[PDB]
Amino acid sequence: MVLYFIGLGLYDERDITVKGLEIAKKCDYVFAEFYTSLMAGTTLGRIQKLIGKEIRVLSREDVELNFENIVLPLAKENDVAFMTPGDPLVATTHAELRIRAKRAGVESYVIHAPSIYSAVGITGLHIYKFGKSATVAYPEGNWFPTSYYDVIKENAERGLHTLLFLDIKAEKRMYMTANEAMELLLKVEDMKKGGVFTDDTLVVVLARAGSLNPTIRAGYVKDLIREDFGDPPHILIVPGKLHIVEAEYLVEIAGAPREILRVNV
Amino acid sequence: MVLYFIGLGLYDERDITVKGLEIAKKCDYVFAEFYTSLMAGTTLGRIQKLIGKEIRVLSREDVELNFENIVLPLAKENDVAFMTPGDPLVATTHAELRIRAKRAGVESYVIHAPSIYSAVGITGLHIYKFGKSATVAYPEGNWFPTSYYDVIKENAERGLHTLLFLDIKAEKRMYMTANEAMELLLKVEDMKKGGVFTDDTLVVVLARAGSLNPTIRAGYVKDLIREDFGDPPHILIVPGKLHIVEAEYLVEIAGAPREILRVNV
Ligand SMILES: Nc1ncnc2c1ncn2[C@@H]1O[C@H](CSCC[C@H](N)C(=O)O)[C@@H](O)[C@H]1O
Numbered sequence: 001m002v003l004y005f006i007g008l009g010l011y012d013e014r015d016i017t018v019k020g021l022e023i024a025k026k027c028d029y030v031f032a033e034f035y036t037s038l039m040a041g042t043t044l045g046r047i048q049k050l051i052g053k054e055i056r057v058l059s060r061e062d063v064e065l066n067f068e069n070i071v072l073p074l075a076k077e078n079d080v081a082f083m084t085p086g087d088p089l090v091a092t093t094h095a096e097l098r099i100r101a102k103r104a105g106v107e108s109y110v111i112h113a114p115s116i117y118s119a120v121g122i123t124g125l126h127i128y129k130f131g132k133s134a135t136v137a138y139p140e141g142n143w144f145p146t147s148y149y150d151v152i153k154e155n156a157e158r159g160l161h162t163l164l165f166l167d168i169k170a171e172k173r174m175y176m177t178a179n180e181a182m183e184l185l186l187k188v189e190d191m192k193k194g195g196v197f198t199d200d201t202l203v204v205v206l207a208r209a210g211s212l213n214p215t216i217r218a219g220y221v222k223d224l225i226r227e228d229f230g231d232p233p234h235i236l237i238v239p240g241k242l243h244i245v246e247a248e249y250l251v252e253i254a255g256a257p258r259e260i261l262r263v264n265v
Numbered sequence: 266m267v268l269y270f271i272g273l274g275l276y277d278e279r280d281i282t283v284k285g286l287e288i289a290k291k292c293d294y295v296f297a298e299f300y301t302s303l304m305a306g307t308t309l310g311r312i313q314k315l316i317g318k319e320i321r322v323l324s325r326e327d328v329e330l331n332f333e334n335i336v337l338p339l340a341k342e343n344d345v346a347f348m349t350p351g352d353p354l355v356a357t358t359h360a361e362l363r364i365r366a367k368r369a370g371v372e373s374y375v376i377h378a379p380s381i382y383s384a385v386g387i388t389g390l391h392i393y394k395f396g397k398s399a400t401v402a403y404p405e406g407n408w409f410p411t412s413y414y415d416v417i418k419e420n421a422e423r424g425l426h427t428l429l430f431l432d433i434k435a436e437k438r439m440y441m442t443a444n445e446a447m448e449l450l451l452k453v454e455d456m457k458k459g460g461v462f463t464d465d466t467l468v469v470v471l472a473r474a475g476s477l478n479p480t481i482r483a484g485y486v487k488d489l490i491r492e493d494f495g496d497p498p499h500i501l502i503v504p505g506k507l508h509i510v511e512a513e514y515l516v517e518i519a520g521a522p523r524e525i526l527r528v529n530v
């Protein structure tokens with residue numbers, strides 16, 4: 001008689017929580033979307049096999065325009081689950097769907113799963129030091145998004161780290177790489193000339209968090225701009241002022257140049 | 266030869282991921298710490314039964330001072346797990362433990378799990394809007410720390426939300442309640458007179474995130490300062506200016522007063 005929002009986790013089907021799996025196994029109907037993020041280590045089948053149910057995958061349009069016509073009607077007389085990559089309410093507009101559920105007289109519950117937002121901890125950067133986050137969006141036609149550049153500036157001015165979600169166009173099989181993000185940022189810097197993002201800027205790249213062997217790299221843009229970080233998904237991070245131990249981790253674990261060990265306090 | 270950092274999740278024993286559970290079950294030795302946080306919805310016994318291994322509990326000193334003498338030696342010739350509440354490497358000093366592992370010639374891998382950092386998305390507040398985070402600490406003796414107040418000030422001023430962790434004495438099993446945090450903040454405001462935290466400030470309280478029935482409440486301090494939010498753990502958030510969609514969620518899901526739709530947007 002309820003609707004469950006269940007996160008699938010970072011990388012593969014095993015990133016779901018035990019709680020999420022046991023509840024998903026007993027739901028009458030299971031829906032999911034795979035446009036808000038990319039789970040590079042699994043397939044729909046592997047997820048269906050684990051949960052033991054057929055899964056109706058919905059498009060962005062099905063959800064944003066027809067969630068109350070496709071999913072909610074069933075939750076009024078059945079236990080329904082809506083599954084998503086990572087945590088269902090992180091960097092998505094899915095929270096608003098709980099409002100739609102309420103208006104349709106449907107109770108909803110949320111089962112969390114590991115999210116890229118907290119996975120940044122594996123970069124060695126203190127998570128409490130992250131400031132406002134942003135998304136590097138693909139330019140479209142004459143429209144060239146740039147607000148994410150200002151976020152970095154605002155955070156850097158405060159000595160805070162900046163988490164940059166990268167764009168995704170699932171229907172086009174498009175997943176922005178950290179390289180493409182760095183190129184776009186260099187272009188905005190050329191236009192705004194704020195000294196925010198240059199070839200000498202230290203950045204951190206995290207690719208395929210959740211996998212056992214994610215790619216964790218730190219260094220200057222000039223050096224990483226063309227480095228191969230492996231398959232998507234990727235996130236780009238622009239650190240603010242570093243603590244001694246953050247620099248030590250970036251060097252020992254992320255292969256950063258030993259020169260960043262020397263911090264200018 | 267391998268050390269696994271495994272997150273336990275948010276609330277109870279089912280908050281660990283399928284990946285984390287299967288890996289823990291294959292480890293020869295399993296260690297855990299509950300000094301950074303406690304799994305309020307479960308017990309050591311229930312966790313132990315689920316994993317089917319005896320769990321070696323470690324104190325803050327065991328970890329910070331002797332991780333390399335207690336955990337790493339065993340990791341040399343066995344598969345060892347180090348489990349922590351939430352997502353591994355979120356606690357500020359844990360990332361450095363991977364450096365110790367490296368120095369000991371021990372391979373380490375991270376198995377993620379839900380963290381309050383991402384779980385707060387259930388409050389309906391957009392994750393990208395959170396700024397620097399902080400912890401509300403109890404004053405004691407001649408020491409009256411107030412940095413967390415400045416963090417709120419710096420975030421709000423930029424239209425950002427502030428995630429506030431509340432003081433905890435794991436050993437004594439003493440939790441600071443949201444009610445106590447609000448009282449402390451009002452006291453700090455009376456001192457700095459910054460107009461940052463008053464009876465008219467809008468706050469959000471999240472209790473028992475991870476549970477199927479968490480407490481999510483939003484409203485003005487004057488109305489919530491004496492409200493019962495249930496058993497801990499409690500998390501306090503001071504939102505910046507709200508996106509109308511954030512406000513609508515708080516009203517419809519968190520029982521916030523209609524007033525926020527015009528006053529805090
Ligand atoms: N495993 C992963 N590794 C690296 N980046 C990831 C990732 N999962 C998600 N992202 C990043 O986040 C973007 C999707 S944003 C949606 C995030 C999701 N709800 C969560 O909780 O993680 C991707 O385009 C990518 O930039």
Ligand code: NA
Pocket residue numbers: 127130131382395396397398
């Ligand atoms: Na944050």
